[PDB]
């Protein structure tokens, strides 16, 4: 009963556009009625006083009906294609807009590559379902529902024979389908195994001739081929059935209905027009049942993907409530933390309660071991989630009562694997500020010493960079991120190992630039290297969610035991 | 006219199996004849003295013909599937056996990954061509060739009307196909561009929220969607034409032929049976022409791949002549080189003429700069090609008059990227000797110190390793290759930077093992590191295909100027 829910949800999403869907129902009903009436008219024209009499009017009206069917067949397909494409693009808009504001926590919880794979796969499958169902699978249901009573009231006995033929055909089709699906597991296992073997043993191209094993490899692959043939032999007939059962049933039904009609005419109570109309009914229903079976098979194959997409959409549906809450302006940088604690893996907290205060005009540097407390500190600085216990206040205002719009906008960010778009580097620089303009970008590039490297080389500053910096290295995207951060001129800068990918000569000038360009702002630098930490003001210590050392450079010379050991070690 | 050659070659390859192909021709002819005779019998039974008279015999014979058609439809499909699968496996056998003996020079000239891609792609396409043509595309040609004269001699005027309908249908189908293919370029460009954009901007998942550009990204993607819709709008009707022209032409032809027949009957010179037979002929030819058009479209799509496969097969066809030429036995290792020269890129030789002699019981080490002469030296040692000018002699016998069977079998090989199969490590060790057995493999593993690393860890010595050592590192495959080389106990060992992927403690013991296990054999070690070269006997020098220094360790202390500088440098 799960599939019916899927169909109901798909139709509910489809029925959003009410200005172009109402005509589809009437068009489908009209085409079903005309395709049902065509064989009856064929019978009427064939049985016209043997073969003489006024037949000009029946021929004319049949030709008019055929022309109407032609026009409907042309127009409905185009309408369905347009509506399906528009609805696909609209649902893509909705899914994108709903997912872009979704926090990163759930993204890293469920993964991102799988999310994209399922999203585009489900969009394609749902588009396939929306389109094919508007052309050849909505009219068939109406045609059958109208055919059953007409055929019954015409000749109930032939009607029940017809129903028996239909049900036996669908049963044998289902049996054939299930047998084929049972055989595929073994057949693909052997098939993929053999092709993997041959791909490896040819792409190696260095060990097939480094072993002198032409004969052994040939014998092994012959044995694999023999095994595959022995596995294929049991399932051969079912392929023939699955390939020709439509024609099988069509011919069988036509022969049986024609011989039954002739046998009844032998006594004499009917004509030939109704017989040929019944033949047309039989072939039409056989074709439509084949189409319906194919549609059901496709839906069963895609059910898992559609169910996963629906589950993801429902999971991302329930979100926060938009409101015009008061924001903050002219941020200074006086952040206070009290009793902040958050559990990342839900199996033990990484950080403990802490009471910290940072004042404007003084940078703060934290250095620690391989513990994960620094990441939690950065996350609570950015406020990417709702802390379970703690208090974060800015400028006399709580961070929970301030919307992300300004609260973030006052805060920058630079990490190691800074995502770069796949478009040009010039746009990847202009994306540092909302609109900006093309004179200060050069100043930012000079300030980060990233102008000469991109102007002379890289075919100018208008080159397309690949995904995840596939064309550049760590240092190049590093310098680009530094340039973006400095041109953004955010009041607060947060740093996390943002200088660990260049040699000493460039590292020294990068540190000098980021220090000379940042005096009236507070920076939070987090790095294992002990080169950029000496240019800070406040020195902190991290150890398994605890505080031991928190002071300046003129107090750490004799305070603490582990910090002195770390300082003398390197 | 190129396609006809492709069809001829495909049929020539198919006709190899003459014991199961002759029956296919007669089966196809019989099914074509019965499917042509079915509508005529339908007409005969419908037109049987109005609707009275002896019709039991026509019904019985028609039912027998229908049963024969049913049996043929069941049996021919299975026969075609079996024959196509057997022929596919056979041609795979032939291609593998012909390519495995193919030298590596052409493989690296044309590439390997592309070779595999085209080989399996062409095999799949050729199997598709072999199968579909045996069921629904060989009988149609015979059916048409038999229908044209029968229909002409029945009613030439309706026959020419039928031919006109067929030709106009195929012309409009071709026009529709070409218009669709013309639109494909633009539609796919915009489609892939939009999906690449959305994939990048969702998989980044770190910069859509690091820019505060929800509105800008939404507007940009809306503009992209609008552009895609504006590009899709011009091509909408042509899609409807392709997804319904079959039914279009079928209905139009049926209506026109029936109205023409009724108009001729109005005067009165014919009956209804021939009319319904003509209707059946029209629908049958419409369906078969649709199938033929689809087949031609598929063949045009696959023509490039088939042509490339045929060209590759012809290129690899012409090879050497097998012969029982005299081989060598009990190799010692006294190799002489004189005036050997070979050009790798055909744009300048890398090596020059040289006169070198190596004696048994003395290893030879060559050290040189980043020049490519060492690779040429190794290649001429292995004799993987035919040198243009030079003389290589072993044991009083030329290498050109000795087959590769023994000439190689006396020679081992170890490189950096030693190919490992995707199967278990135990087999990757047993592949060092032809048959061997499971006691000396442990001795070899202990000798290379590769037993403890694989027994305790890696879930025993029966673990599956990925392609190109995807699961292991350089050191592990390194030690496995060293173990394979030492267990192969070849009279001559050639080394090429085969010790450059481990720390000093393991490198020292590896060198000690390979030296203690090799005294009565000559080894050729080629490495840039100056650690394993000191354990050699004869010291050589390489410089741009020249000889400067060639002696022992007791002569290099004052001979040469560059060698002393290199020795003191590191
Ligand atoms: O405007 C509007 C419009 O549109 C349109 O559309 C368009 C488009 O565009 C679009 C887009 O698109 C996209 C796409 O898509 C995609 C993508 O993806 C991705 C990719 O992917 C991939 C894949 O691949 C794969 C592979 O695999 C495979 C293999 O195989 C193997 C095997 O095995 C097997 C077995 O065998 C057996 C046998 O069987 C047989 C059968 O037979 C049958 C048949 O039937 C049929 C027919 O058909 C016909 C028709 O019909 C149709 C139509 O439709 C239309 C449409 O249109 C549209 C609309 O919308 C408008 O207009 O479309 C469609 C499609 O969908 C088409 O089709 C058309 O066009 O219509 C009608 C009406 O009525 C209906 O019906 C339907 O629908 O028609 C025509 C003429 O006629 C044609 O077409 C055709 O022909 O029919 C029938 C009825 O009548 C039925 O039944 C069916 O349907 O055939 C025959 C005749 O001919 C018959 O008779 C029979 O019955 O078949 C099958 C198939 O083929 C098979 O099965 C076979 O062949 O049997 C025997 C005995 O007999 C035995 O013995 C054997 O064994 O089988 C089994 C079962 O179970 C299994 O196993 C299988 O299957 O084996 C062999 C030997 O061994 C060989 O062959 C081989 O080996 O392999 C594997 C393993 O084994 C398997 O499994 C498989 O299957 O593979 C590979 C490697 O690995 C992988 O990869 C995979 O897996 O696929 C694809 C496809 O496409 C491709 O492409 C690729 O390659 O990938 C990549 C990555 O990067 C890329 O490329 C992509 O991306 O995409 C997406 C995602 O993203 C999605 O979507 C998808 O997925 O694509 C393209 C390119 O790319 C582009 O375009 C795009 O992208 O999108 C959308 C939608 O979707 C939208 O937006 C648009 O628009 O385009 C298209 C193209 O296609 C066109 O077409 C159109 O135009």
Question: Domain extents for chain B?
Answer: 1-316, 335-569
Tell if the CB–CB gap between A195 and B120 is shorter than 8 Å. yes
Interface A-B: count of C-beta contacts within 8 A: 222
| Strand ranges for A452-556 from DSSP E | 492-494, 522-526, 538-541, 550-551
Which secondary structure element, helix H or strand E, spans residue B27, and what is its range? Answer: helix B22-46
Q: Do A116 and B203 touch (CB under 8 A)?
A: yes
Under 8 Å between Cβ of A377 and A547? no
Of A261, A397, A250, A43, residue with least CA distance to B70: A250
CB B315 within 8 A of CB B115: no
Ordered DSSP codes for B451-512: SHHHHTSTTTT-PBP-GGGSSS-HHHHHHHHHHHHHHHT-SEEEBSS-S-SS-HHHHHHHHH
- Contact of B60 with chain A, judged by CB distance below 8 Å, is answered with no
Q: Which residue of B has its CA nearest to A111?
A: B203
Q: Which atom of ligand 1 is nearest to the CA of B239?
A: 62
B541: left (phi over 0), alpha (psi -120 to 50) or beta: beta
Taking the C-alpha atoms of residue B66 and residue B74, their distance in angstroms, rounded to an integer, is 12
Q: Tell me if chain A has a CB within 8 Å of the CB of B352.
A: no
| 3-class DSSP state of B398 | strand
Q: How far is CA B111 from CA A204, A205, B102, in A?
A: 12, 10, 13
Residue B197 contacts residue B189 (beta carbons within 8 Å): no
CA distance A348 to B527: 52
Nearest-CA residue for ligand 1 atom 166 is B192
Whole-angstrom distance, CA of residue A488 vs CA of residue A387: 28
Backbone dihedral angles phi then psi of residue B315, each to the nearest 5 degrees: -65, -40
Query: Which of B180, B185, B282 is closest to B241 using CA atoms?
Result: B180
Closest CA to B42 of B300, B276, B288: B276
How far, in Å, is the centroid of ligand 1 from the Cα of A229? Answer: 25
Superfamily grouping for domain A335-569: P-loop containing nucleotide triphosphate hydrolases (3.40.50.300)
Expressed in Å, this structure's resolution amounts to: 4.0
Handedness of CA B211, B213, B217, B218 (dihedral sign): positive
Ordered DSSP codes for A149-208: HHHHHHHHHHHHHHHHHHHHHHHHHHHHHHHHHHHHHHHHHHHHHHHHHHHHHHH--SSS
CB contact under 8 Å between A104 and B218, yes or no, is no
Beta strands in A369-497 (DSSP E): 389-394, 397-398, 492-494
d(CA A274, CA A154): 9
CB contact under 8 A, B100 and A271: no
In our burial notation (b when 16+ CB lie closer than 10 A, e otherwise), range A29-65 reads ebbbeebbbbbbbbbbbbbbeebeeebeebbeebeeb
The candidate with the shortest Cα–Cα distance to A477, out of A427, A422, A417, is A417
A241 contacts in B (CB within 8 Å)? 74
Whether A90 has a binding-site annotation, put simply, is no
3-class secondary structure, B411: strand
Q: Is B13 in the pocket of ligand 1 (CB under 6 A)?
A: no
When CB atoms are compared, the residue of A100, A258, A467 closest to B208 is A100
Beta bridge partners of B367: B541
Q: Are A531 and A338 in contact (CB under 8 A)?
A: no
Q: What's the rounded Cα separation, in Å, for the pair B221 and A96?
A: 10
Asked whether the beta carbons of residue A46 and residue B272 sit closer than 8 angstroms, the reply is yes
Distance CA B102, CA A209 (A): 9
List the beta bridge partners of residue B543.
Answer: none
At residue A457, what are phi and psi to the nearest 5 degrees?
-95, -175
Picking from B112, B237, B252, the nearest residue to A203 by CB comes out as B112
Which residues of B are documented as binding site? 368-375
Per the entry, the structure determination technique was cryo-EM
Q: Which residues contact A376 (CB under 8 A, 6 or more apart)?
A: A342, A344, A350, A351
- Among residues A310, A346, A401, the alpha carbon closest in space to that of A109 is found at A346
Which bin fits B397, alpha (ψ -120 to 50), beta or left (φ > 0)?
beta
Q: Tally Cβ neighbours within 10 Å of residue A320.
A: 10
Pocket test for ligand 1, best of A135, A184, A242, A243 (most atoms within 8 A of CB): A243
Asked if A212 reaches chain B (Cβ–Cβ under 8 Å), the answer is yes
Asked if the domains A1-316 and A335-569 are classified in one and the same CATH topology, the answer is no
Q: How far apart are CA A355 and CA B62, in angstroms?
A: 97
Q: List CB contacts of B144: < 8 A, sequence separation 6 or more.
A: B285, B288
In the block, tokens 């300046």 appear at A552
CA A400 to chain centre: 32
Closest residue by Cα to residue A221 from A211, A210, A208: A208
Task: Return the structure tokens found at A290.
Answer: 């084949």
The Cβ of residue A374 has, within 10 Å, a number of other Cβ atoms equal to 22
Cα distances (Å, whole numbers) of residue B2 to A189, B8, B124: 38, 10, 21
**What is B185-206 written as a DSSP string?**
HHHHHHHHHHHHHHHHHHH--S
Distances (CA, A) of A416 to B278, B339, B473: 76, 57, 26
Q: Is the CB of B239 under 6 A from ligand 1?
A: yes
Structure tokens at B360: 């048994």
Answer yes or no: are the C-beta atoms of A203 and B116 closer than 8 Å. yes
Q: To the nearest whole angstrom, how far is the Cα of A55 from the nearest Cα of chain B?
A: 8
Which residues have a Cβ under 8 Å from the Cβ of B43 and sit 6 or more positions away?
B271, B272, B273, B274, B275, B276, B277, B280
Q: In terms of C-beta distances under 8 Å and separation of at least 24 residues, what long-range contacts does B452-460 make, across chains too?
A: B453/B479, B454/B425, B458/B425
- Classified as helix, coil or strand, B429 is helix
**Other beta carbons within 10 Å of B207:** 18
Smallest CA-to-CA distance from A86 within B185, B243, B237, B232 is with: B232
Mutant choice from B31, B64, B100 vs A, greatest count of A C-beta within 10 A: B100
Alpha-carbon span B339 to B388, nearest angstrom = 10
Q: Does A375 show up as a binding residue in the annotation?
A: yes
Which atom belonging to ligand 1 lies closest to the Cα atom of B88?
129
Q: How far apart are CA A506 and CA B508, in angstroms?
A: 38
Question: In angstroms, rounded to a whole number, what is the distance separating the alpha carbons of residues A205 and B384?
Answer: 13
Residue of A nearest to B113 (CA): A203
Distance from CA of B552 to the nearest CA of A (A): 32
Q: Residues B73, A244: contact at Cβ < 8 Å?
A: yes
End-to-end CA distance of chain B: 67
Atom 116 in ligand 1: residue holding the nearest Cα: B81
For residue B410, give every residue at least 6 positions away whose Cβ sits within 8 Å of its Cβ, in sequence order, or none: B328, B331, B490, B491, B492
Are A180 and A260 contacting, i.e. CB atoms less than 8 angstroms apart?
Answer: no
A328 touches A407 (CB < 8 A):
yes
Chain A contact present for B71, CB below 8 A: no
Residues of B at the annotated binding site for ATP?
A: 368-375
- A228: which chain B residues are within 8 Å (Cβ-Cβ)? 89
A226 in contact with chain B, both atoms CB, cutoff 8 A? no
| b/e per residue A230-263 (b: at least 16 CB within 10 A) | eebeeeeebbbbebbbbebbbbbbbbbbbbebbe
Distances (CA, A) of B485 to A263, B419, B478, B493: 85, 13, 11, 8
Which chain B residues are within 8 Å of A59, Cβ to Cβ? 258-259, 262
Ligand 1 binding pocket includes B243 (Cβ within 6 Å): yes
Atom index in ligand 1 nearest the CA of residue B124 equals 131
- Between CA B255 and CA B248 the distance in angstroms is 11
Does A555 sit in the ligand 1 pocket, CB within 6 Å? no
Ligand 1 within 6 A of CB of B196: no
Surface-to-core class of residue A564, CB atoms within 10 Å of its CB (0-12 exposed, 13-18 middle, 19+ buried): middle
User: What CA–CA distance (Å, rounded) separates A548 from A539?
Assistant: 11
Tell me the C-alpha to C-alpha distance, in Å, between residue A163 and each of A140, A148, B395.
16, 9, 88
What's the fold here for domain A1-316? ABC transporter transmembrane region fold (1.20.1560)
Residue B282 and residue B119 in contact, taking contact as beta carbons nearer than 8 Å:
no
Tell which B residues from 236 to 255 touch A, by Cβ distance under 8 Å: 236-237, 239-241, 243-244, 247-248, 251-252, 255
């Amino acid at each position: 009963m799960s599939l019916l829910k899927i169909y109901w949800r798909a139709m509910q999403y489809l029925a959003v556009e009410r200005t172009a869907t109402i005509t589809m129902c009437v068009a489908s009903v009209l085409v079903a009625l005309v395709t049902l009436a065509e064989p009856v008219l064929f019978g009427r024209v064939i049985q016209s006083i043997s073969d003489k009499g006024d037949i000009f009017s029946p021929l004319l009206m049949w030709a008019a009906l055929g022309g109407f069917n032609i026009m409907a067949a042309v127009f409905v397909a185009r309408g369905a294609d347009r509506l399906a494409h528009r609805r696909r693009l609209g649902v893509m808009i909705d899914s994108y807009e709903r997912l872009i504001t979704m926090p990163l926590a759930w993204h890293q919880k469920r993964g991102t590559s799988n999310a994209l794979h399922t999203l585009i796969r489900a969009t394609d499958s749902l588009f396939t379902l929306w389109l094919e169902f508007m052309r050849q699978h909505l009219t068939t249901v109406v045609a059958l529902a109208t055919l059953i009573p007409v055929a019954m009231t015409m000749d109930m006995r032939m009607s029940l024979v017809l129903i028996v033929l239909g049900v036996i055909y669908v049963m044998i089709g289902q049996l054939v389908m299930r047998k084929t699906k049972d055989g595929q597991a073994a057949v693909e296992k052997h098939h993929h195994k053999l092709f993997e073997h041959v791909s490896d043993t040819i792409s190696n191209v260095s060990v097939v001739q480094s072993y002198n094993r032409i004969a052994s490899e040939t014998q092994a692959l012959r044995d694999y081929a023999k095994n595959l043939e022995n596995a294929q032999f049991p399932v051969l007939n079912w392929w023939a059935l699955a390939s020709g059962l439509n024609r099988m049933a069509s011919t069988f039904s036509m022969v049986v209905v024609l011989v039954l009609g002739a046998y009844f005419v032998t006594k004499g109570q009917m004509r030939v027009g109704d017989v040929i109309a019944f033949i047309g009914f039989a072939q039409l229903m056989i074709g439509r049942l084949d189409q319906i079976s194919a549609f059901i098979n496709q839906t069963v194959t895609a059910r898992a993907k559609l169910e996963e997409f629906f589950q993801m959409e429902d999971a991302t549906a329930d979100r926060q409530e938009p409101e015009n809450v008061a924001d903050l302006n002219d941020v200074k940088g006086d952040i206070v933390f009290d009793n902040v604690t958050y559990e990342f893996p839900n199996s033990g907290q990484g950080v403990y309660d802490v009471s910290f205060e940072v004042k404007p005009g003084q940078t703060v540097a934290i250095v620690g071991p391989t513990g994960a407390g620094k990441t939690t500190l950065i996350n609570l600085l950015q406020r990417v989630f709702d802390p379970a216990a703690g208090r974060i206040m800015i400028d006399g205002t709580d961070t929970r009562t301030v919307s992300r719009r300004s609260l973030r906008h006052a805060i920058a960010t630079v990490f190691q694997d800074a995502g770069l778009f796949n478009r040009s580097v010039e746009d990847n620089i202009r994306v540092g500020r909302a609109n900006a303009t093309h004179e200060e970008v050069h100043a930012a590039a000079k300030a980060a010493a990233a102008h000469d490297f991109i102007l002379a080389k890289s075919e100018g500053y208008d080159t397309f960079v690949g995904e995840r910096g596939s064309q550049l290295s760590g240092g190049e995207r590093q310098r680009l991120a530094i340039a973006r951060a400095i041109l953004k001129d955010s009041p607060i800068l947060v740093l996390d190992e943002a200088t660990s990918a260049l040699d000493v000569e460039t590292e020294e000038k990068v540190t000098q630039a980021v220090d000379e360009l940042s005096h009236n702002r507070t920076t939070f630098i987090i790095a294992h290297r002990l080169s950029t930490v000496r240019s800070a003001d406040l020195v902190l210590f991290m150890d398994k969610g605890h505080l031991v050392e928190s002071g300046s450079f003129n107090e750490l010379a004799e305070r603490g035991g582990r910090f002195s050991d770390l300082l003398r070690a390197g």
